[PDB]
Amino acid sequence: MIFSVDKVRADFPVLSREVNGLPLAYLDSAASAQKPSQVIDAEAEFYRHGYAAVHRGIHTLSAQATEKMENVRKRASLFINARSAEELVFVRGTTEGINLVANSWGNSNVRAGDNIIISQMEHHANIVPWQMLCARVGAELRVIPLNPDGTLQLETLPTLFDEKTRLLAITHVSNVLGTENPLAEMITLAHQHGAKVLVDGAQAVMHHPVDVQALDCDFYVFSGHKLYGPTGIGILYVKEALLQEMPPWEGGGSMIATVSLSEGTTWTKAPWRFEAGTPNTGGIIGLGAALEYVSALGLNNIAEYEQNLMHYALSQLESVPDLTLYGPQNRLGVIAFNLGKHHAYDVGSFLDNYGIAVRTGHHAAMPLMAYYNVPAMCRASLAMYNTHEEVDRLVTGLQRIHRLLG
Amino acid sequence: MIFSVDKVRADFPVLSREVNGLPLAYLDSAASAQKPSQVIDAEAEFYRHGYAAVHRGIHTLSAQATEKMENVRKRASLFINARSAEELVFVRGTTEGINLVANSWGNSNVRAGDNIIISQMEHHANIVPWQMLCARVGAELRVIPLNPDGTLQLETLPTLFDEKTRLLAITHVSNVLGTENPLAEMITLAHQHGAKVLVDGAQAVMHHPVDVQALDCDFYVFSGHKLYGPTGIGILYVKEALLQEMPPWEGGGSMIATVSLSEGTTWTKAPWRFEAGTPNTGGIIGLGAALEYVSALGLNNIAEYEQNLMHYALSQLESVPDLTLYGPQNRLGVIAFNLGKHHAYDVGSFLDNYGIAVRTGHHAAMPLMAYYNVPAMCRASLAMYNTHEEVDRLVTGLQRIHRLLG
Ligand SMILES: Cc1ncc(COP(=O)(O)O)c(CN[C@@H](CS)C(=O)O)c1O
Ligand SMILES: Cc1ncc(COP(=O)(O)O)c(CN[C@@H](CS)C(=O)O)c1O
Numbered sequence: 056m057i058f059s060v061d062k063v064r065a066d067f068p069v070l071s072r073e074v075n076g077l078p079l080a081y082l083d084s085a086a087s088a089q090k091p092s093q094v095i096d097a098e099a100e101f102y103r104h105g106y107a108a109v110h111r112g113i114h115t116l117s118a119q120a121t122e123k124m125e126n127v128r129k130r131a132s133l134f135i136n137a138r139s140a141e142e143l144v145f146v147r148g149t150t151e152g153i154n155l156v157a158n159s160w161g162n163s164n165v166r167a168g169d170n171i172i173i174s175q176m177e178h179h180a181n182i183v184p185w186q187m188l189c190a191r192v193g194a195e196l197r198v199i200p201l202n203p204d205g206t207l208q209l210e211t212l213p214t215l216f217d218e219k220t221r222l223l224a225i226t227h228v229s230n231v232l233g234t235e236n237p238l239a240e241m242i243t244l245a246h247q248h249g250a251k252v253l254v255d256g257a258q259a260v261m262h263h264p265v266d267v268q269a270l271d272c273d274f275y276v277f278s279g280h281k282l283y284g285p286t287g288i289g290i291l292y293v294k295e296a297l298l299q300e301m302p303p304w305e306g307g308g309s310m311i312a313t314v315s316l317s318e319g320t321t322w323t324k325a326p327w328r329f330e331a332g333t334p335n336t337g338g339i340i341g342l343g344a345a346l347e348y349v350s351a352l353g354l355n356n357i358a359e360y361e362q363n364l365m366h367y368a369l370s371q372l373e374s375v376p377d378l379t380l381y382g383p384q385n386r387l388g389v390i391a392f393n394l395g396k397h398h399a400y401d402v403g404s405f406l407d408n409y410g411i412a413v414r415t416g417h418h419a420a421m422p423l424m425a426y427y428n429v430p431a432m433c434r435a436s437l438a439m440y441n442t443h444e445e446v447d448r449l450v451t452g453l454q455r456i457h458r459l460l461g
Numbered sequence: 462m463i464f465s466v467d468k469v470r471a472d473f474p475v476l477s478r479e480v481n482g483l484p485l486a487y488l489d490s491a492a493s494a495q496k497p498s499q500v501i502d503a504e505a506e507f508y509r510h511g512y513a514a515v516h517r518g519i520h521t522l523s524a525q526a527t528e529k530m531e532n533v534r535k536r537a538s539l540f541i542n543a544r545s546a547e548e549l550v551f552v553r554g555t556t557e558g559i560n561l562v563a564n565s566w567g568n569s570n571v572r573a574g575d576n577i578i579i580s581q582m583e584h585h586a587n588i589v590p591w592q593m594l595c596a597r598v599g600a601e602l603r604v605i606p607l608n609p610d611g612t613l614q615l616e617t618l619p620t621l622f623d624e625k626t627r628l629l630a631i632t633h634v635s636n637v638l639g640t641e642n643p644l645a646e647m648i649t650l651a652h653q654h655g656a657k658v659l660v661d662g663a664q665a666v667m668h669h670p671v672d673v674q675a676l677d678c679d680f681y682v683f684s685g686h687k688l689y690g691p692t693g694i695g696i697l698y699v700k701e702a703l704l705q706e707m708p709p710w711e712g713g714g715s716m717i718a719t720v721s722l723s724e725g726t727t728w729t730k731a732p733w734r735f736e737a738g739t740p741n742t743g744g745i746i747g748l749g750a751a752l753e754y755v756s757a758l759g760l761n762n763i764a765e766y767e768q769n770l771m772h773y774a775l776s777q778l779e780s781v782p783d784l785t786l787y788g789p790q791n792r793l794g795v796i797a798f799n800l801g802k803h804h805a806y807d808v809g810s811f812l813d814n815y816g817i818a819v820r821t822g823h824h825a826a827m828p829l830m831a832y833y834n835v836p837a838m839c840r841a842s843l844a845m846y847n848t849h850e851e852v853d854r855l856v857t858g859l860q861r862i863h864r865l866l867g
């Protein structure tokens with residue numbers, strides 16, 4: 056296998072940290088990824104040597120900073136195979152991107168009596184903005200239900216889609232179940248009704264290549280900090296024909312063409328129309344470095360190593376008594392589980408005591424928890440820098456916990 | 462004088478940079494400030510040694526990251542003398558903070574037939590969101606006009622304020638003129654009508670102490686990157702009694718209490734109700750370091766040095782032929798000027814050629830330009846790390862430009 060987990064781990068300084076006296080096993084990348092020194096240092100070097108305002112003054116440092124920013128936009132657009140860099144808007148993250156669509160596109164395209172379709176596995180980020188829109192305009196939020204194995208009940212779609220369905224908002228990969236949804240086919244179906252499709256790609260972009268032209272999605276969102284990048288930065292992709300018709304959301308400097316207190320205000324062109332005020336230039340530089348880092352490893356190399364690691368994990372976990380897994384066998388990135396009747400809060404506390412970082416709780420997916428009739432779950436993320444040894448530590452930990460608490 | 466500009470400059474690595482072969486004179490801090498290595502390194506060290514998700518999992522690194530974040534919120538609240546840390550919301554910047562108020566507070570408190578009052582010196586960030594609100598609800602945007610010297614025509618306020626005035630939105634310090642407005646007295650007047658007051662403090666917080674209890678403003682906004690901090694982070698302060706009644710703006714994870722696809726969704730408490738999705742944790746750590754750095758220098762020490770430098774600049778500039786200054790004599794931070802009939806774009810290009818970074822154009826204040834009947838202006842910011850020598854370089858440059866282009 057062409058991927059070298061030991062060379063990659065050497066790029067991540069936090070991975071040398073110790074917790075409760077033992078070496079850290081960081082199994083919470085789905086909540087946020089650790090960052091390589093290449094990403095950390097690119098941001099710091101920008102601040103140390105080339106920092107200035109962008110899209111404003113035209114002196115040397117400002118000119119060069121603005122070019123660096125727009126170069127990141129180009130690099131990002133190539134990463135997802137968008138047709139044009141101008142189809143990408145810099146946002147704080149997946150959550151802000153979804154909210155931008157819900158307001159700018161939703162407010163002018165969804166009216167009383169209409170319906171929107173989400174799924175029962177959606178993260179709150181891809182639920183709440185649509186509930187807010189549905190309440191603003193008097194529309195109905197319809198829900199694709201789950202099967203026990205964590206896949207979508209695709210047979211229900213004929214009854215959910217009708218001529219008043221304006222949008223399907225759907226996750227690419229579940230943050231709990233690891234399910235990858237059949238986006239291409241669902242998007243074909245939605246387009247046959249005249250619906251647009253927003254894809255929540257927050258848990259997809261780090262696991263394999265993503266091609267928004269091949270998908271034909273109308274909107275796609277993801278967050279930098281889960282793609283081994285800095286916080287406070289993400290990407291919203293919107294098909295150019297939709298984007299150029301969308302009205303601004305936030306108002307302020309840089310997104311205007313002209314401002315008058317007697318004759319009103321006119322807007323600049325997309326995507327800058329959607330970027331009011333000073334951007335997170337530092338985070339944009341760091342995001343560019345993160346894309347370069349991931350592209351240098353090769354997403355198909357990453358996918359190969361992670362799928363191998365996940366198969367090993369699922370195999371070893373069979374030797375844990377009374378373990379319940381949630382989701383399908385072909386899961387990406389995350390393993391969701393409970394141990395016997397012990398509360399997830401407790402299982403995660405013990406694991407933390409062993410130096411093992413997992414997330415416990417509802418994982419911002421309360422409807423998903425409700426479907427499985429549990430209050431909470433434990434979750435282990437298995438990212439490209441995690442190791443078989445870390446997997447063994449988790450398995451052994453769960454065995455100890457079962458024995459001690461049985 | 463207790464401030465040592467040479468020791469301070471030694472903290473700023475970019476200040477050693479060279480531009481067009483000469484030492485950089487960075488006179489554009491009003492657009493964004495350079496950052497000390499204390500700020501740069503605090504963020505980088507966080508990423509290198511303690512990075513994790515906040516307000517989510519409770520394992521060791523996450524617990525410590527969440528505490529660091531909430532400690533910054535506390536430090537920020539003490540910096541502006543807010544009564545409680547829970548009156549501060551983390552935002553992308555001043556612009557996003559104003560938009561949050563315009564939507565969450567504006568949409569439920571400003572109705573058809575109402576009026577809002579801004580001034581003719583406002584930055585677009587404190588104009589456009591109110592124009593958008595006024596168009597959403599059918600309200601009127603009223604304007605306090607300017608005097609020739611760059612002060613507000615305060616005699617007009619009796620005719621602008623009435624019983625339907627819901628909000629005064631007013632800049633603390635102009636980003637062009639350097640005018641500091643009489644906020645305390647204007648806020649007393651506005652409160653007598655039952656109006657609330659949002660203060661745009663983006664150009665105030667780095668120049669002297671700011672005390673929102675003494676001001677009694679209802680909202681106050683500022684940006685981290687102008688306070689020697691990272692990009693992508695800012696602060697919105699809102700009086701607790703107003704904040705706890707405001708509805709959420711963005712929806713998603715972390716701002717909810719419960720989420721149901723059959724029984725709807727309930728919200729968490731302020732300020733977290735206003736912080737949807739993963740925050741800019743990296744920028745928050747860096748902002749905390751920036752507040753500690755500025756507080757260690759002492760804002761009254763900074764104000765003393767800057768006011769001395771500004772007095773020197775205004776004195777030396779008298780020896781530039783055909784220079785027009787805009788604004789009052791007691792200006793803070795920025796000097797706005799034009800040279801003869803030469804376009805500002807050209808004057809700034811020559812200055813850039815001398816290694817001198819100024820901003821030229823409308824400075825996101827087109828109504829202000831209109832009032833002075835010019836298309837554009839040059840602007841020199843004189844921040845706490847700038848020097849008398851840099852001032853001489855600007856004066857000499859403008860003399861050369863006048864001679865060469867006369
Ligand atoms: C499928 C999906 N969609 C949207 C989001 C929100 O991303 P933000 O960067 O917080 O805006 C996430 C967030 N992932 C984390 C944090 S709640 C978790 O599961 O631990 C996600 O998994
Ligand atoms: C008075 C005032 N109010 C709001 C803003 C907007 O801040 P943001 O951080 O871009 O959101 C600014 C922005 N200052 C810069 C950038 S446009 C300038 O004048 O060069 C300002 O001066």
Ligand SMILES: [Cl-]
Pocket residue numbers: 307308309310311585824825826
């Ligand atoms: Cl502007």
Ligand SMILES: [Cl-]
Pocket residue numbers: 179418419420713714715716717
């Ligand atoms: Cl949540």
